[PDB]
Design an enzyme around this catalytic site. Structure first.
Site, PDB file in Angstrom:
ATOM      1  N   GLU A  35       0.637  -0.816  -0.067  1.00 23.51           N
ATOM      2  CA  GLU A  35      -0.369   0.097  -0.460  1.00 23.51           C
ATOM      3  C   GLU A  35       0.597   1.226  -0.150  1.00 23.51           C
ATOM      4  O   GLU A  35       0.115   2.159  -0.593  1.00 23.51           O
ATOM      5  CB  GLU A  35      -1.184  -0.063   1.669  1.00 23.51           C
ATOM      6  N   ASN A  46      -7.399  10.218  -6.127  1.00 21.67           N
ATOM      7  CA  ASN A  46      -8.475   9.353  -7.240  1.00 21.67           C
ATOM      8  C   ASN A  46      -9.433  10.407  -7.518  1.00 21.67           C
ATOM      9  O   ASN A  46     -10.663  10.537  -6.627  1.00 21.67           O
ATOM     10  CB  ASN A  46      -9.173   8.490  -6.560  1.00 21.67           C
ATOM     11  N   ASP A  49     -13.470   9.689  -7.733  1.00 23.29           N
ATOM     12  CA  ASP A  49     -14.452   9.602  -7.232  1.00 23.29           C
ATOM     13  C   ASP A  49     -13.887  11.025  -6.128  1.00 23.29           C
ATOM     14  O   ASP A  49     -14.830  10.918  -5.333  1.00 23.29           O
ATOM     15  CB  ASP A  49     -14.909   8.306  -6.472  1.00 23.29           C
ATOM     16  N   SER A  51     -11.780  10.955  -3.653  1.00 28.25           N
ATOM     17  CA  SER A  51     -11.532  10.802  -2.500  1.00 28.25           C
ATOM     18  C   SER A  51     -10.104  10.725  -3.095  1.00 28.25           C
ATOM     19  O   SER A  51      -8.872  10.859  -3.006  1.00 28.25           O
ATOM     20  CB  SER A  51     -11.571   9.331  -2.760  1.00 28.25           C
ATOM     21  N   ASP A  53      -6.264   8.519   0.008  1.00 26.62           N
ATOM     22  CA  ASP A  53      -6.137   6.943   0.827  1.00 26.62           C
ATOM     23  C   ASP A  53      -5.267   7.765   0.993  1.00 26.62           C
ATOM     24  O   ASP A  53      -4.006   8.328   1.052  1.00 26.62           O
ATOM     25  CB  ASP A  53      -5.554   6.126  -0.404  1.00 26.62           C
ATOM     26  N   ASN A  60      -9.026   5.439   2.429  1.00 27.60           N
ATOM     27  CA  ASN A  60      -9.278   6.239   1.833  1.00 27.60           C
ATOM     28  C   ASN A  60     -10.518   6.876   2.600  1.00 27.60           C
ATOM     29  O   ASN A  60     -11.961   6.318   3.459  1.00 27.60           O
ATOM     30  CB  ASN A  60     -10.421   5.233   0.436  1.00 27.60           C
TER      31      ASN A  60
END
Length: 130
Positions: A35, A46, A49, A51, A53, A60
């Site tokens: 990750e 991202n 959408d 958002s 992380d 998220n």
């Protein structure tokens, strides 16, 4: 902070992650490695959408933490996403624990399914004394 492998393994074990909801330390290590490369300030936007992380587990903002800028998002971990960018990972671990209490468990992270599920992950904890 970018953790060294065994340092992180012991840090997570001390935080009660070994076997949390049936998930071994090695699995958490594999998740963190893929990750963020064990980097607590890792961030990924991202655009699809809107958002983001955050942190070592790339949690998220649409569902888990609040950053105020994510459209129609919720805050299941009841944390500012800023808490997921600290050198100390206690809050991120509490949030990661919250994520796995849901139906999917460790499968919540697509990266875990892609690079850890049904893989030999012994290598992540060997030599760390955990």
């Amino acid at each position: 902070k970018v953790f060294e492998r065994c340092e992180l393994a012991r840090t997570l074990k001390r935080l009660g992650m070994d076997g949390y909801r049936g998930i071994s330390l090695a699995n958490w290590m594999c998740l963190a490695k893929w990750e963020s490369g064990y980097n607590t300030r890792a961030t990924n936007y991202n655009a699809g959408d809107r958002s983001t992380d955050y942190g070592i587990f790339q949690i998220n903002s649409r569902y888990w933490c609040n950053d105020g800028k994510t459209p129609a998002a919720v805050n299941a971990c009841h944390l500012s996403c800023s808490a997921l960018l600290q050198d100390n990972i206690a809050d991120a671990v509490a949030c990661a624990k919250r994520v796995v209490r849901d139906p999917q468990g460790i499968r919540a992270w697509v990266a875990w399914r892609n690079r850890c599920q049904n893989r030999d992950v012994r290598q992540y904890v060997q030599g760390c004394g955990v």
